[PDB]
Design a protein around this ligand. Structure first.
Ligand SMILES: *[C@@H]1O[C@H](CO)[C@@H](O[C@@H]2O[C@H](CO)[C@@H](O[C@@H]3O[C@H](CO[C@H]4O[C@H](CO)[C@@H](O)[C@H](O)[C@@H]4O)[C@@H](O)[C@H](O[C@H]4O[C@H](CO)[C@@H](O)[C@H](O)[C@@H]4O[C@H]4O[C@H](CO)[C@@H](O)[C@H](O)[C@@H]4O)[C@@H]3O)[C@H](O)[C@H]2NC(C)=O)[C@H](O)[C@H]1NC(C)=O
Ligand code: 5VG
Ligand code: NAG
Lengths: 129, 111, 50
């Protein structure tokens, strides 16, 4: 399997733009997909969007679309999320998740949707103070 | 808009007993559903994928089934560490527009 | 009258033959897939030597 370490929690002033990381380690990096999902304190889970490495293409959420940006880097084996126009209503915990896909490098691929491994979940506080 | 709803709003049941949960869809979602339990403040865990099979490295006392717009998960005999909130989630549509369920609270049936 | 066998896989990320690109497709269908033909020609290439 792999392990997904995250960054350190953060506080951001409103009306800003936030970036957050997540590093994976343990296996060949391309062969896994990735997804970002967040949760407000004691609530449901907000599926944000996913990304395919081997093709490096990301899909986003409808009502989140516009101020979101996922990205990756095969060299350093990491994944970055960025979100734009920070508003206090988005303080929450965030998680990077993945799943094995198959022999991508040889042209095999199945495009699973569910989420096998999980990270801890950083925390982001957007607020006045 | 495809929407799921968990049922019931809360289940409660005592040890040695079975728990039953049912997820509800809005159209036909053939075999794309998944179940995760979350102990409060912890990384969730994969229980059922494909809406018909069990994960690897997981106790065999869980099992779900269903189709169409009605799905369910049951565990025949609770134990001491099965106290977490449970979520269903679908991944059927393409282009990908995935969505998560509500989540239901599960504590012992005890006074 | 024995035969020959070959290890045929089914892929999902291919280099288009129409252009310079790359494509994806869904995973394979559920069921039995058969295919009958008879090769009637082929393409070779020499090797620079003496
Ligand atoms: C060189 O030239 C040859 C000659 O054509 C060519 O071979 C042909 O290949 C095709 C595809 O490889 C074969 O077509 C398949 O044939 C089967 C057999 O059907 C029988 O029953 C029908 C009923 O009407 C009869 O008419 C027929 O004569 C056969 O007896 C079909 O069943 C296939 O259709 C299925 O596959 C499609 C794939 O998408 C499905 O969309 C379609 O709906 C059918 O699917 C159903 O069954 C699936 C099976 O899993 C199931 O999953 C689905 O859910 C659904 O239920 C298909 O038409 C054709 O028979 C071959 N001809 C031969 C062998 O003489 C070579 O392909 C060609 N060379 C190259 C390189 O292409
Ligand atoms: C000396 N070599 C010359 C040479 C080498 C390789 C190639 C060309 C020429 C053309 C083409 C390059 N352009 C491109 N790739 N977009 C590339 N061929 C292909 O991509 C190709 O055949 N794909 C393909 C896919 C699926 C099926 Cl079923 C199939 F029958 C074929
Ligand atoms: C080769 O197979 C095709 C399809 O079955 C058939 O039509 C053809 O007649 C075969 N070869 C010849 C030239 O007989």
């Amino acid at each position: 399997e792999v392990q997904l370490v995250e960054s350190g929690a953060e506080v951001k002033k409103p009306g800003s733009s936030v970036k957050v990381s997540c590093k994976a380690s343990g296996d060949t990096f391309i062969r896994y997909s990735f997804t970002w999902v967040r949760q407000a304190p004691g609530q449901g889970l907000e599926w944000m969007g996913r990304i395919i490495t081997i093709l490096d293409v990301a899909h986003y959420a409808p009502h989140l679309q516009g101020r979101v940006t996922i990205t990756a880097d095969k060299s350093t084996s990491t994944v970055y999320l960025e979100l734009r126009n920070l508003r206090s209503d988005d303080t929450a915990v965030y998680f990077c998740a993945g799943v094995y896909e198959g022999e991508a490098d040889e042209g095999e691929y199945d495009n699973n949707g569910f989420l096998k491994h999980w990270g801890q979940g950083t925390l982001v506080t957007v607020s006045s103070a | 808009d495809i929407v799921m709803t968990q049922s019931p709003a809360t289940l409660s049941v005592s040890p040695g007993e079975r728990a039953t949960l049912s997820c509800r869809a809005s159209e036909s979602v053939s075999s794309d559903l998944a179940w995760y339990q979350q102990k409060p403040g912890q990384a969730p865990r994969l229980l059922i994928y494909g809406a018909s099979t069990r994960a690897t490295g997981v106790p065999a006392r869980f099992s779900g089934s269903g189709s169409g717009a009605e799905f369910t998960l049951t565990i025949s005999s609770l134990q001491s560490e099965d106290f977490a909130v449970y979520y269903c989630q679908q991944y059927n549509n393409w282009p990908p527009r995935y969505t998560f369920g509500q989540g239901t609270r599960l504590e012992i049936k005890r006074t | 009258n024995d035969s020959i066998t070959l290890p045929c896989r089914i892929k999902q990320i291919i280099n288009m033959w129409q252009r310079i690109g790359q494509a994806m497709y869904a995973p394979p269908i559920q069921g039995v897939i058969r295919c009958v033909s008879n090769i009637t020609g082929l393409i070779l290439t020499r090797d620079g030597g003496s």
